[PDB]
Design a protein around this motif. Structure first.
Motif, PDB file in Angstrom:
ATOM      1  N   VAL A  68       0.947  -1.312  -0.099  1.00  0.00           N
ATOM      2  CA  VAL A  68       0.149  -0.154   0.091  1.00  0.00           C
ATOM      3  C   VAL A  68       1.015   1.333   0.095  1.00  0.00           C
ATOM      4  O   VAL A  68       0.416   2.378  -0.550  1.00  0.00           O
ATOM      5  N   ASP A  69       2.080   1.080   0.375  1.00  0.00           N
ATOM      6  CA  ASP A  69       3.012   2.347   0.517  1.00  0.00           C
ATOM      7  C   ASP A  69       3.433   2.620  -0.928  1.00  0.00           C
ATOM      8  O   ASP A  69       4.027   3.574  -1.337  1.00  0.00           O
ATOM      9  N   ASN A  70       3.155   1.686  -2.039  1.00  0.00           N
ATOM     10  CA  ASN A  70       3.310   2.194  -3.353  1.00  0.00           C
ATOM     11  C   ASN A  70       2.278   1.906  -4.394  1.00  0.00           C
ATOM     12  O   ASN A  70       1.518   1.165  -4.324  1.00  0.00           O
ATOM     13  N   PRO A  71       1.929   3.146  -5.008  1.00  0.00           N
ATOM     14  CA  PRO A  71       2.705   4.516  -4.940  1.00  0.00           C
ATOM     15  C   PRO A  71       2.628   5.339  -3.645  1.00  0.00           C
ATOM     16  O   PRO A  71       3.199   6.443  -3.422  1.00  0.00           O
ATOM     17  N   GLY A  72       1.480   5.019  -2.897  1.00  0.00           N
ATOM     18  CA  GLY A  72       1.285   5.701  -1.682  1.00  0.00           C
ATOM     19  C   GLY A  72       0.362   6.828  -1.556  1.00  0.00           C
ATOM     20  O   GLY A  72      -0.110   7.459  -2.738  1.00  0.00           O
ATOM     21  N   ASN A  73      -0.398   7.261  -0.506  1.00  0.00           N
ATOM     22  CA  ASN A  73      -1.157   8.456  -0.160  1.00  0.00           C
ATOM     23  C   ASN A  73      -1.069   9.259   1.096  1.00  0.00           C
ATOM     24  O   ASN A  73      -1.051   8.213   1.989  1.00  0.00           O
ATOM     25  N   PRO A  74      -0.881  10.221   1.165  1.00  0.00           N
ATOM     26  CA  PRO A  74      -0.741  10.993   2.363  1.00  0.00           C
ATOM     27  C   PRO A  74      -1.685  10.623   3.851  1.00  0.00           C
ATOM     28  O   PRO A  74      -1.451  10.755   4.916  1.00  0.00           O
ATOM     29  N   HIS A  75      -2.924   9.909   3.259  1.00  0.00           N
ATOM     30  CA  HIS A  75      -3.793   9.726   4.269  1.00  0.00           C
ATOM     31  C   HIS A  75      -4.254   8.374   4.556  1.00  0.00           C
ATOM     32  O   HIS A  75      -5.107   7.879   5.187  1.00  0.00           O
ATOM     33  N   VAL A  76      -3.146   7.541   4.369  1.00  0.00           N
ATOM     34  CA  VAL A  76      -3.107   5.888   4.653  1.00  0.00           C
ATOM     35  C   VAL A  76      -1.820   5.909   5.436  1.00  0.00           C
ATOM     36  O   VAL A  76      -0.765   6.216   4.858  1.00  0.00           O
ATOM     37  N   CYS A  77      -1.796   4.966   6.564  1.00  0.00           N
ATOM     38  CA  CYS A  77      -0.589   4.691   7.330  1.00  0.00           C
ATOM     39  C   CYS A  77       0.368   3.780   6.513  1.00  0.00           C
ATOM     40  O   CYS A  77      -0.071   3.042   5.646  1.00  0.00           O
ATOM     41  N   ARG A  78       1.829   3.900   6.956  1.00  0.00           N
ATOM     42  CA  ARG A  78       2.663   3.086   6.387  1.00  0.00           C
ATOM     43  C   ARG A  78       3.199   1.931   7.342  1.00  0.00           C
ATOM     44  O   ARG A  78       3.820   2.354   8.426  1.00  0.00           O
ATOM     45  N   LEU A  79       2.871   0.785   7.117  1.00  0.00           N
ATOM     46  CA  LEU A  79       3.556  -0.615   7.763  1.00  0.00           C
ATOM     47  C   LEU A  79       5.062  -0.487   7.739  1.00  0.00           C
ATOM     48  O   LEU A  79       5.649  -0.587   6.431  1.00  0.00           O
ATOM     49  N   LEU A  80       5.881   0.033   8.582  1.00  0.00           N
ATOM     50  CA  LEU A  80       7.235   0.122   8.367  1.00  0.00           C
ATOM     51  C   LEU A  80       8.096  -1.457   8.612  1.00  0.00           C
ATOM     52  O   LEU A  80       9.137  -1.822   8.029  1.00  0.00           O
ATOM     53  N   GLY A  81       7.337  -2.335   9.342  1.00  0.00           N
ATOM     54  CA  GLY A  81       7.889  -3.715   9.507  1.00  0.00           C
ATOM     55  C   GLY A  81       7.103  -4.322  10.440  1.00  0.00           C
ATOM     56  O   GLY A  81       5.955  -4.158  11.254  1.00  0.00           O
ATOM     57  N   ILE A  82       7.524  -5.731  10.545  1.00  0.00           N
ATOM     58  CA  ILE A  82       6.762  -6.798  11.189  1.00  0.00           C
ATOM     59  C   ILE A  82       7.895  -7.663  12.042  1.00  0.00           C
ATOM     60  O   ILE A  82       8.739  -7.983  11.572  1.00  0.00           O
ATOM     61  N   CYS A  83       7.367  -7.985  13.213  1.00  0.00           N
ATOM     62  CA  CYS A  83       8.295  -8.708  13.989  1.00  0.00           C
ATOM     63  C   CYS A  83       7.390 -10.216  14.398  1.00  0.00           C
ATOM     64  O   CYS A  83       6.581  -9.941  15.327  1.00  0.00           O
ATOM     65  N   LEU A  84       7.810 -11.382  14.077  1.00  0.00           N
ATOM     66  CA  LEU A  84       7.208 -12.421  14.359  1.00  0.00           C
ATOM     67  C   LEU A  84       7.721 -13.283  15.263  1.00  0.00           C
ATOM     68  O   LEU A  84       8.871 -13.921  15.041  1.00  0.00           O
ATOM     69  N   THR A  85       7.259 -13.405  16.634  1.00  0.00           N
ATOM     70  CA  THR A  85       7.700 -14.259  17.504  1.00  0.00           C
ATOM     71  C   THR A  85       6.554 -15.147  18.062  1.00  0.00           C
ATOM     72  O   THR A  85       5.746 -15.455  16.934  1.00  0.00           O
ATOM     73  N   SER A  86       6.240 -15.376  19.210  1.00  0.00           N
ATOM     74  CA  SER A  86       4.975 -16.263  19.623  1.00  0.00           C
ATOM     75  C   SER A  86       3.668 -15.169  19.480  1.00  0.00           C
ATOM     76  O   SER A  86       2.746 -15.728  19.115  1.00  0.00           O
ATOM     77  N   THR A  87       3.911 -13.898  19.200  1.00  0.00           N
ATOM     78  CA  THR A  87       3.082 -12.741  18.733  1.00  0.00           C
ATOM     79  C   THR A  87       3.318 -12.057  17.508  1.00  0.00           C
ATOM     80  O   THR A  87       4.521 -12.145  17.082  1.00  0.00           O
ATOM     81  N   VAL A  88       2.436 -11.341  16.938  1.00  0.00           N
ATOM     82  CA  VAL A  88       2.589 -10.668  16.023  1.00  0.00           C
ATOM     83  C   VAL A  88       2.930  -9.234  16.318  1.00  0.00           C
ATOM     84  O   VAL A  88       2.137  -8.706  17.074  1.00  0.00           O
ATOM     85  N   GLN A  89       4.013  -8.437  15.948  1.00  0.00           N
ATOM     86  CA  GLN A  89       4.309  -7.081  16.279  1.00  0.00           C
ATOM     87  C   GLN A  89       4.177  -6.211  14.916  1.00  0.00           C
ATOM     88  O   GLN A  89       5.101  -6.499  14.176  1.00  0.00           O
ATOM     89  N   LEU A  90       3.268  -5.242  14.967  1.00  0.00           N
ATOM     90  CA  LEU A  90       3.383  -4.368  13.445  1.00  0.00           C
ATOM     91  C   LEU A  90       4.065  -2.968  14.036  1.00  0.00           C
ATOM     92  O   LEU A  90       3.613  -2.614  15.093  1.00  0.00           O
ATOM     93  N   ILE A  91       4.880  -2.653  13.046  1.00  0.00           N
ATOM     94  CA  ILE A  91       5.404  -1.158  13.354  1.00  0.00           C
ATOM     95  C   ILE A  91       5.200  -0.264  12.431  1.00  0.00           C
ATOM     96  O   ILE A  91       5.033  -0.395  11.295  1.00  0.00           O
ATOM     97  N   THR A  92       4.900   1.212  13.125  1.00  0.00           N
ATOM     98  CA  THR A  92       4.736   2.355  12.141  1.00  0.00           C
ATOM     99  C   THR A  92       5.260   3.722  12.908  1.00  0.00           C
ATOM    100  O   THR A  92       5.588   3.463  13.907  1.00  0.00           O
ATOM    101  N   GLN A  93       5.236   4.573  12.198  1.00  0.00           N
ATOM    102  CA  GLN A  93       5.710   5.996  12.534  1.00  0.00           C
ATOM    103  C   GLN A  93       4.765   6.449  13.630  1.00  0.00           C
ATOM    104  O   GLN A  93       3.651   5.948  13.540  1.00  0.00           O
ATOM    105  N   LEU A  94       5.234   6.707  14.761  1.00  0.00           N
ATOM    106  CA  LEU A  94       4.418   7.242  15.864  1.00  0.00           C
ATOM    107  C   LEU A  94       3.567   8.398  15.602  1.00  0.00           C
ATOM    108  O   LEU A  94       4.019   9.509  15.136  1.00  0.00           O
ATOM    109  N   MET A  95       2.187   8.328  15.601  1.00  0.00           N
ATOM    110  CA  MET A  95       1.366   9.421  15.613  1.00  0.00           C
ATOM    111  C   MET A  95       0.976  10.199  16.844  1.00  0.00           C
ATOM    112  O   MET A  95       0.580   9.491  17.680  1.00  0.00           O
ATOM    113  N   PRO A  96       1.758  11.217  17.134  1.00  0.00           N
ATOM    114  CA  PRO A  96       1.623  11.863  18.330  1.00  0.00           C
ATOM    115  C   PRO A  96       0.254  12.210  19.003  1.00  0.00           C
ATOM    116  O   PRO A  96       0.226  12.158  20.198  1.00  0.00           O
ATOM    117  N   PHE A  97      -0.707  12.555  18.420  1.00  0.00           N
ATOM    118  CA  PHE A  97      -2.041  12.883  18.816  1.00  0.00           C
ATOM    119  C   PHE A  97      -3.032  11.940  18.836  1.00  0.00           C
ATOM    120  O   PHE A  97      -4.360  12.112  19.233  1.00  0.00           O
TER     121      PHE A  97
END
Ligand SMILES: *CCC(=O)N1Cc2nc(-c3cc(-c4cnn(C(F)F)c4C)c(F)cc3F)n(-c3ccncn3)c2C1
Length: 277
Positions: A68-97
């Motif tokens: 979804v980051d390609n080509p992208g849209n400013p009003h859609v979040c970007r999944l930066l990465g995933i960490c798979l252990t016993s749980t799924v961890q999803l990483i994105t840029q922090l939205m401070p508000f």
């Protein structure tokens, strides 16, 4: 297209932002593999063994969310990465508000018509982009719209429902409740409920009515009431999102045009105490 598989040493969890049945959201820090830079991230740690999918099938779903980051849209979040252990961890840029739902509840007497109508445009732009990518969100709600800055909102949690395999009945179109049919037109229904949440400053839809009675109430023609600040022009747009026939509901492309016209003269469409500046 570019899905980063993160090692647990690359990122650190600092504090809890919010919890729930889904799992937990953490404010953290990430140092990419071949980089010497600290990036403020938000980590969503999902609840263990909820999904029957193996790690390989989880990765395929995460690849789609990352594409979804390609080509992208400013009003859609970007999944930066995933960490798979016993749980799924999803990483994105922090939205401070945080999310738009908490924001409108906490800032009610300071939100003017210009803000509310611009957010409606932005959410329709992001939703229209997901429709262009052939991606059905399935869970559009004001809690799934994040605030980067008060004048810039982004849609999150797209593809998270498909990754997993409480159902949000009060945001679902009648055909999704009765037959589990999810389309871009059932997302239009959820968009109408999201606009209703914003126009009521974070009110809970169908408050007091049990989720088991929602489908029969919709079949009787009962819809979410007209919010006090809305003129009939704004209410009619939300009302068209809640049509029984999915093909008769407006398209996100049309919703952009309608709300964009209203945002050019916002005091004519929303009557808010405090806009008399
Ligand atoms: C009212 C605030 C609230 O309810 N929040 C829930 C929430 N989720 C996230 C969040 C989401 C994701 C995620 C899941 N799927 N995708 C993508 F579409 F594929 C994403 C981007 C995530 F990876 C991390 C994550 F924290 N947040 C959140 C909080 C702060 N900054 C960003 N996201 C919230 C808040």
């Amino acid at each position: 297209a570019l899905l980063r598989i993160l090692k647990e040493t690359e990122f650190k969890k600092i504090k809890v932002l919010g919890s729930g049945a889904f799992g937990t959201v953490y404010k953290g820090l990430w140092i990419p593999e071949g980089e010497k830079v600290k990036i403020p991230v938000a980590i969503k740690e999902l609840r263990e063994a909820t999904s029957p999918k193996a790690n390989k099938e989880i990765l395929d779903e995460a690849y789609v969310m990352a594409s979804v980051d390609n080509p992208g849209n400013p009003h859609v979040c970007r999944l930066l990465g995933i960490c798979l252990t016993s749980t799924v961890q999803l990483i994105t840029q922090l939205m401070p508000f945080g999310c738009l739902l908490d924001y409108v509840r906490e800032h009610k007497d300071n939100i003017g018509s210009q803000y509310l109508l611009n957010w409606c445009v932005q959410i329709a732009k992001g939703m229209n982009y997901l429709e262009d990518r052939r991606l059905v969100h399935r869970d559009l709600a004001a809690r799934n719209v994040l605030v980067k800055t008060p004048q810039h909102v982004k849609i999150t949690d797209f593809g998270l429902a498909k990754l997993l395999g409480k159902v949000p009945i009060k945001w679902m179109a009648l055909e999704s409740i009765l037959h589990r049919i999810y389309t871009h037109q059932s997302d239009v229904w959820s968009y109408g409920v999201t606009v209703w949440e914003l126009m009521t400053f974070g009110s809970k839809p169908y408050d007091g009515i049990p989720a088991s009675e929602i489908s029969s109430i919709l079949e009787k023609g009962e819809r979410l009431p007209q919010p006090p600040i809305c003129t009939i022009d704004v209410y009619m747009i939300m009302r068209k999102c809640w049509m029984i026939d999915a093909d008769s509901r407006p398209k996100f492309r049309e919703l952009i045009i309608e709300f964009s016209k209203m945002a050019r003269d916002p005091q004519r469409y929303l009557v808010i105490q405090g806009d008399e500046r």
